[PDB]
Write an enzyme that holds these catalytic residues in place. Structure first.
Site, short mmCIF file in Angstrom:
data_model
loop_
_atom_site.label_atom_id
_atom_site.label_comp_id
_atom_site.label_asym_id
_atom_site.label_seq_id
_atom_site.Cartn_x
_atom_site.Cartn_y
_atom_site.Cartn_z
N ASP A 120 0.89 -1.16 0.00
CA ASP A 120 0.00 0.00 0.00
C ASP A 120 0.95 1.24 0.00
O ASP A 120 2.13 1.13 0.37
CB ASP A 120 -0.87 -0.01 1.28
CG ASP A 120 -1.90 1.10 1.39
OD1 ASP A 120 -2.39 1.55 0.35
OD2 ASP A 120 -2.23 1.51 2.54
N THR A 132 -3.09 1.11 -4.26
CA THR A 132 -3.46 2.15 -3.32
C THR A 132 -4.79 2.82 -3.59
O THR A 132 -5.20 3.00 -4.74
CB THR A 132 -2.32 3.19 -3.26
OG1 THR A 132 -2.66 4.23 -2.34
CG2 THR A 132 -1.99 3.80 -4.62
N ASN A 133 -5.44 3.25 -2.51
CA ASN A 133 -6.61 4.08 -2.57
C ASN A 133 -6.09 5.50 -2.57
O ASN A 133 -5.52 5.96 -1.57
CB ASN A 133 -7.52 3.86 -1.36
CG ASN A 133 -8.40 2.65 -1.48
OD1 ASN A 133 -8.35 1.88 -2.46
ND2 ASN A 133 -9.20 2.43 -0.45
N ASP A 167 38.51 13.19 -15.43
CA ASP A 167 39.60 12.81 -16.33
C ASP A 167 39.72 13.85 -17.49
O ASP A 167 39.75 15.05 -17.19
CB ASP A 167 39.42 11.33 -16.76
CG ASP A 167 40.57 10.78 -17.58
OD1 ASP A 167 41.60 10.37 -16.98
OD2 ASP A 167 40.44 10.75 -18.84
N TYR A 180 53.32 6.72 -20.52
CA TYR A 180 52.34 6.07 -21.38
C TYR A 180 51.72 7.05 -22.41
O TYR A 180 51.20 6.59 -23.42
CB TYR A 180 51.23 5.42 -20.54
CG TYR A 180 50.28 6.43 -19.93
CD1 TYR A 180 50.61 7.11 -18.77
CD2 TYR A 180 49.08 6.73 -20.54
CE1 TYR A 180 49.77 8.06 -18.23
CE2 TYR A 180 48.23 7.70 -20.02
CZ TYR A 180 48.57 8.35 -18.85
OH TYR A 180 47.74 9.31 -18.32
N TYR A 237 44.69 13.05 -26.77
CA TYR A 237 46.09 13.09 -26.32
C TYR A 237 47.06 13.62 -27.37
O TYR A 237 48.25 13.79 -27.07
CB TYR A 237 46.55 11.67 -25.99
CG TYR A 237 45.90 11.06 -24.77
CD1 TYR A 237 46.42 11.27 -23.51
CD2 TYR A 237 44.80 10.22 -24.90
CE1 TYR A 237 45.85 10.68 -22.39
CE2 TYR A 237 44.21 9.65 -23.78
CZ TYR A 237 44.76 9.85 -22.53
OH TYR A 237 44.21 9.27 -21.42
N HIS A 282 41.02 5.57 -9.91
CA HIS A 282 40.77 6.44 -11.04
C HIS A 282 39.28 6.53 -11.48
O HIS A 282 38.85 7.59 -11.87
CB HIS A 282 41.66 6.04 -12.23
CG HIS A 282 41.43 6.92 -13.42
ND1 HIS A 282 41.88 8.23 -13.44
CD2 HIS A 282 40.68 6.70 -14.53
CE1 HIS A 282 41.43 8.75 -14.56
NE2 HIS A 282 40.71 7.86 -15.25
O1 6N4 Z 1 44.23 14.21 -17.76
C1 6N4 Z 1 44.16 13.50 -18.99
C2 6N4 Z 1 43.79 12.04 -18.82
S1 6N4 Z 1 45.10 11.18 -17.92
C3 6N4 Z 1 44.76 9.50 -18.21
N1 6N4 Z 1 43.55 8.95 -17.88
C4 6N4 Z 1 43.60 7.62 -18.19
C5 6N4 Z 1 42.67 6.59 -18.08
C6 6N4 Z 1 43.06 5.33 -18.53
C7 6N4 Z 1 44.33 5.10 -19.06
C8 6N4 Z 1 45.26 6.15 -19.16
C9 6N4 Z 1 44.88 7.43 -18.73
N2 6N4 Z 1 45.59 8.61 -18.71
#
Ligand code: 6N4
Ligand code: 6N4
Lengths: 546, 546
Positions: B8, B122-123, B334, B382, B465, B523
């Protein structure tokens, strides 16, 4: 020869200018003449104001530099600034007071429609004040009417530096002699004149417009009132919501503020509200203009019972749920207006306010079937023609260009007689094969409707007429109710089918009903009298729906 | 055996009940005991309240009938009602006081996840009061958690009439012995019991939940806190806006109120905000969760320069223009967080407030190229691997299931080392081919990302990037500026790349910056600690963005 017109923002497209407010502030505070204008320009090319106009610093960073300049100037003038002297307060009021110079904007719009490229070239700043939204709103309104907007703080250059004029010519793809440049500051015209541009010094608007008419050969000053700004389908945000597994509704969305849902009639589109969408968004509303079920990009299932009012209203409630809207103002026209009265009767908690254009609220008669009532009035005879599945579809889908050109006409341009439609055996039996284009629509607008109906045809739209008994049975449940939420009924004097007289007993069911009436207006209210519709809806929304 | 649970609304899913407020009103006004409850039930099946619950009349039409009933009852009791006696005032406060009984709603959610069909029977009434929005909001919040909502005023039947129970069983497609029925009114359980349903009389919530656990065999009372409610992609409103001829942005939209734009990072989707979208909409905001350029249903042109910050920010401004939004709050994570700081620096008038999750504001160094700075920190090595077009795309697109399962992991579940990525010659060189599923994501959530990346791949996303020098040159224009609009920086303790220490000098550029910090969070902030993110954003929005 001339093909581009450039306008300044401050003192030309928006009035009053900032420099004018500085002069009035000096007079009001009995400061020495020109003191605030000298502090504003202190340092010339290396001064704080040039750094502001180039985007090096923001408005809030400049305010204390300008106050320091005011003190340095007052010291050499041997005067004291008042105790409550505040540059922020002075600038807040100056920016707030600035409104669009409607005659200047109307002249720019007229030049653009005649093939001119139009641009705004302005010395402006990065506004980070708490009240910056007022400026953002002003810029958004102006932006949509110009081909280019070049702001000093975004390009790092200011007028009168000669490179900003070279940048302008490169952006316009024009030689100096093809450009007319309007500005209220004489110093800013000198570089444009050196390059060979036609310049107009703007002191008063009327004299500047007379100079502009003389040099362009186009009438700008005593012209008739233009139509409201209309939508370009390609520039709208298109939304899609699945309300049921086989049913997806399409809508266009514009604006922020209370949600306003627009519901078109037969055989129309979201595009029938093209003149209302920008006006209602500019008035402070979030407009959602639907493609109703059976139309345009919304789903069009073939089953008749998918178009009964009970199902349609339930799906409109689901539409609000999926968007996360607890309420919306509902505004309908024709079949859409029928639906909005039933939304107010069955789901009042989801309806902030309700308005209908042309369509009256007509309560069900529990003693008379709706098919019997249809035969009693020869005005609605054509609805019997729409009953048999396949018959009206074949006639309406035969030539789409002819269907829309024959339907979309002003009251004095009619080529159809809705009486004796069943006797004649069709809606277009004594209608021309190639009718003339009505004055309320262009060929381009007609072709939008043609393209939309090429997709799902007329079956879905006609099915709204094929649930008379189902709708009657459902409406009979609400005979003990009254509509006690804010409501507006707008009648159209010359509507052939939905005559104003059919709305006369609505106060018995909606005691505090508000009314609007449009003279010399036919069935296609939105495109027949768009300015009048806009004024009526906006005033009602601002008082009863806010 | 049991597979359906019916609740209810009044007194069960929402507390306190209306009948409880009538009893307290009698005590507060020193009226004879039960007077208001007798007037409420006056006439039984033919009385005003039954007509209200069946939908024959609306709440506003019932209010004067209930006041008349109060006077008739007071007359036979030989008492006088106070001078300021108002049924409307009493009912307005009673409805307003009613809140969701969170433990009861949590038990319904738990039963639904275990395979139960759940319903509200419900009423209730058609609410046409000026304050009806409060009830519409309550119903919308509850609605989304139940399979069915059956309201008396919509079906024309009331509890305890036996046909409403038959209607319920027909709607559920279940036999009585498979149904548990919870209600606070004993009289409403009797028909359910006669049919063979399991009934629970709800006096206090805890005892009703203990009975429910006993009969279902499912723990409901001392269970851990559930995750926030998440999005079903198929139930969202999808929006599409063309910002440039080749560029269309897709977003999902939910809610009403100030606009909040959510900007995801790499390699994500609008779906990364699945836990924030319903919470932020329920808190009173209109949420727009984007698919950033290069992702999902947004356009993904192959050109590198289409992804430089200057172009991306300009398109986000156009996105606001086409939607008719003068401002939006911008929240990024990010790469999205990088973009939102630059929106605040270059277009402060369009940004109501700015928040970043993990990404700090990092000003450009005019003496050091960004490629030189990358080599100085092995954490960002990276990013050199992401420079060469085609190289990281081939590795990331090779096995999409492996890419997302390897990336989307909690801080303690990592299978990747971002250092020595260039030395190893790949991101997944010493990573398993079939990694285990992380605890923060399900296989179904992973497959949504896989399906989205099957469309345009990783070129668009990686191009964000590949504009280091272009972005650096553009950012150098803002070195004299400060961010003086409301700003929030949220750090994540365990983020491998965007460490909290990288944000420590942000106050020099954003003097009144607000902060949030999430412990034991990696992250993927939104899905790692969704409840903590929601609380931090909602509190900040309510104080600094409203
Ligand atoms: O500030 C720009 C993004 S920095 C960054 N974020 C990520 C997420 C995943 C892999 C590499 C990464 N590198
Ligand atoms: O109130 C229901 C719609 S009445 C109606 N609207 C029309 C528009 C065009 C042709 C016939 C029509 N009949």
């Amino acid at each position: 020869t001339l093909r581009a017109a450039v306008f300044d923002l401050d003192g030309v497209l928006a009035l009053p200018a900032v420099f004018g407010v500085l002069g009035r502030t000096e007079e009001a505070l009995a400061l020495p003449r020109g003191l605030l204008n000298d502090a504003f320009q202190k340092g010339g090319p290396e001064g704080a104001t040039t750094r502001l106009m180039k985007g090096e610093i923001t408005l809030s960073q400049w305010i204390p530099l300008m106050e320091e300049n005011c003190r340095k100037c007052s010291e050499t003038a041997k005067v004291c600034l008042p105790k409550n002297f505040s540059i922020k307060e002075i600038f807040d009021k100056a920016i707030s007071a600035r409104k669009i110079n409607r005659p200047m904007l109307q002249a720019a719009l007229m030049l653009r429609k005649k093939g001119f490229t139009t641009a705004i070239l302005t010395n402006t700043w990065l506004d980070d004040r708490a009240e910056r939204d007022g400026l953002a709103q002003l810029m958004c309104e102006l932006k949509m009417h110009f081909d280019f907007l070049i702001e000093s703080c975004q390009v790092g250059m200011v007028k009168p530096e000669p490179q900003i004029y070279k940048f302008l010519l490169d952006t316009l793809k024009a030689s100096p002699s093809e450009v007319v440049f309007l500005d209220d500051i004489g110093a800013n015209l000198k570089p444009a004149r050196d390059l060979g541009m036609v310049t107009i010094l703007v002191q008063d608007t009327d004299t500047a417009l007379k100079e502009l008419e003389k040099v362009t050969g186009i009438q700008l000053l005593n012209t008739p009132a233009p139509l409201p700004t209309s939508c370009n389908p390609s520039d709208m945000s298109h939304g899609y919501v699945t309300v049921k597994p086989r049913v997806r509704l399409h809508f266009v969305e514009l604006g922020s503020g209370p949600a306003v849902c627009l519901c078109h009639g037969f055989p129309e589109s979201w595009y029938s509200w093209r003149y209302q969408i920008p006006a209602l968004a500019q008035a402070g509303y979030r407009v959602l203009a639907m493609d109703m079920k059976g139309y345009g990009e919304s789903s069009a299932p073939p089953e008749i019972e998918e178009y009964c009012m009970e199902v349609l209203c339930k799906e409109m409630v689901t539409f609000l749920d999926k968007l996360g809207l607890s309420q919306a103002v509902f505004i309908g026209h024709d079949w859409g207006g029928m639906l909005v009265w039933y939304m107010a009767l069955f789901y009042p908690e989801r309806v902030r306010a309700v308005a209908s254009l042309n369509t009256p609220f007509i309560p069900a008669n529990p003693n008379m079937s709706p098919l019997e009532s249809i035969k009693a009035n020869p005005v609605f005879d054509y609805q019997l023609y729409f009953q048999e599945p396949g018959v009206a579809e074949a006639e309406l889908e035969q030539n789409l260009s002819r269907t829309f050109k024959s339907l979309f006409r002003a009251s004095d341009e009619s080529v159809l007689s809705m009486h004796k439609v069943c006797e004649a055996g069709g809606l277009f039996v004594n209608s021309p094969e190639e009718p003339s284009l009505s004055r309320m629509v262009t060929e381009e607008e007609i072709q939008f409707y043609v393209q939309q109906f090429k997709k799902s045809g007329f079956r879905g739209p006609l099915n709204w007429y094929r649930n008379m008994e189902r709708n009657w049975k459902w409406a009979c449940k609400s005979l003990g109710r009254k509509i006690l939420i804010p409501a507006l009924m707008v009648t159209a004097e010359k509507d052939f089918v939905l005559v104003p007289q059919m709305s006369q007993h609505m106060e018995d069911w909606i005691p505090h009903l508000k009314r609007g009436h449009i003279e010399d207006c036919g069935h296609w209210t939105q495109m027949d009298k768009p300015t009048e519709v806009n004024q009526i809806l906006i005033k009602w929304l601002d008082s009863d729906a806010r």
